[model samples]
Target: SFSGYLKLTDNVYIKNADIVEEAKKVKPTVVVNAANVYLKHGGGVAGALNKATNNAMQVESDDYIATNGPLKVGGSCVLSGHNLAKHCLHVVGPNVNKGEDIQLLKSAYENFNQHEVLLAPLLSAGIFGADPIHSLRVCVDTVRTNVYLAVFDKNLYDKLVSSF
Candidate 1:
């Protein structure tokens, strides 16, 4: 719903956009899912992306879990994209334990840096009630390139920009 951009470095930028929609027909980008520990797609970014990928990523996630076990907070797994993007990453959001952990949240975003273009959701804002301002700070601190910080909430987007 909200759209804008922020400079992270000389040639790198972060912005607000739609992940599920932009994942397709782009210049070799990876779609990020703020996933659960099990990497199941019950709801949120995972569910939307699951539907967008024709429910393919869930199957792969099941397989990934079966082989590698449940992912922990800050853990991430990359899978080949299907019908939606060139690649997909499931980064488990930190539990936060009724509070926020900047390091863990930052770690969740760090795994995706190997890729050139990243479409990531401003996760934890809705699901964990983790402050989007802090989330945006962690992202801006860690990510230094072609990145889209997919934020679906209008009010939170305003907060992120105005507060910055």
Candidate 2:
């Protein structure tokens, strides 16, 4: 539950606030990664809308590609405009069959500006029946590098294996 500048490599630095600013400044390509997600409630409509309008929004690709483009995964059409904190992005990743739950949680965390980005967002994303173990594997085994992670899972914080 803290904030600090992380020199991920030699030149890469990311934080909760400045990261979005920098992203907007550079208009850098982004790739959002999420897998084995669980959509819920009445998210079907938004998912259809997002998929239907993906071309207009300009998502580079449906799959997670990191620098190839900035993408989002999970439920709802949350990435519709210039991100309030960053540049306008074509949305991707909200594959409803496997994504809605995590998407909603992630959005809630970002909206609230939680203290722990990775933990809060992750938990929010996966809560409500999301498999924490597989979600964790997706994060660790995939999800690219230098991408922003907003998660919140106390159990995940303690366990190292994919148990959900």
Candidate 3:
């Protein structure tokens, strides 16, 4: 277990880290890709992985979007890659302005909880412009325990940790 992690609800924990690095600390049977609705693996776990290699994930995600379609805020899709985990459950976080903030994000987490052990990002708290407190709260709330939220920014990390 990573020592940097802070306990939340016993089962849930928050870490001032990155999902890509989370793999180095603890292996995930399954992991999550913090994705855009259009399936662009922009930054964070996706970015690091794509940067570490020649970038197959963006191609895979683009191809995924081509095959299935764009993912909705609360919806999800799973994909595979030799670099990450057995499978990466990708979900789109809610845009706070869409009149569907917390609920959809909770679904994103609920859909992910089946793994029992999953590493995910603080969804909607990034460029999507959702409130970090509420957004992080949604993450800590859902699956209540047995889930990990990997956050890279220390300022955001400190702010989030200062809460619950």
Candidate 4:
């Protein structure tokens, strides 16, 4: 097949690679590409897997857009990733240095309870100068006592231990 070059600054030729043993290498009958949006997943579980590799819930990339709240224009939608179990809760923290957004923070807490799943690990959307611990605290406040949090911050681990 003939192809044209992609012109950004200058045009360059594109080449295809060899795939003689392609069929033998692939264990599955077919491999499909999954599409992932920031909060929305295009391919369900498979799409979530793709997003997990890139930490879809954290890194905001070209095709993926992470949100602290909701899709203003549209109604509420669930976040997705890997076997993301069922739901993906995203916790956004208030700006500590300038003073916290107490109302918003309290609302964030309320948001988690509104959902069905009690014990859920959420993706923390760290704000300016806010690390994982800060996000975890805000998350804990949102859910009930039994609610479990799957966090990635070392500081949060320390905090949890000390809290006991």
lDDT of 2 by residue, 1-164 (tens): 23454433332223333223333344433312222222211232223223433443334233323433333443222233233222222222333344354444344323222111221123323323555544444443333334453332345534532232
User: How displaced is residue 114 in candidate 2, in Å?
Assistant: 25
What does candidate 4 score on TM?
Answer: 0.40
Candidate scoring better on lDDT of 2 and 3: 3
In order, candidate lDDTs are 0.73, 0.33, 0.73, 0.34
Root mean square deviation (Cα) for candidate 2: 11.7
State TM-scores per candidate: 0.84, 0.31, 0.84, 0.40
RMSD of each: 3.1, 11.7, 2.4, 17.9
Cα error of candidate 4 at position 59, Å? 13
* Worst ten in a row by lDDT for model 2: 112-121
Residues 1-164 of candidate 4: C-alpha lDDT, one tens digit per residue? 11221211121111121111111232212221112213343333323434544555434332334325333211223444223333443333343444544445444445555554333323223222334445445555445523333333456545544552
Estimate the overall C-alpha local distance difference test score of candidate 2: 0.33
| Candidate 2 residue 129 C-alpha distance from true site, Å | 2.4
The TM-score measured for candidate 3 stands at 0.84
Error of 4 at 37 (Å): 13
Candidate 3 per-residue C-alpha lDDT over 26-124 given as tens digits, one digit per residue, 9 for 90 to 100: 666667776768876666556775554357767888898888889888888877744656677777777665565666778877777667777778777
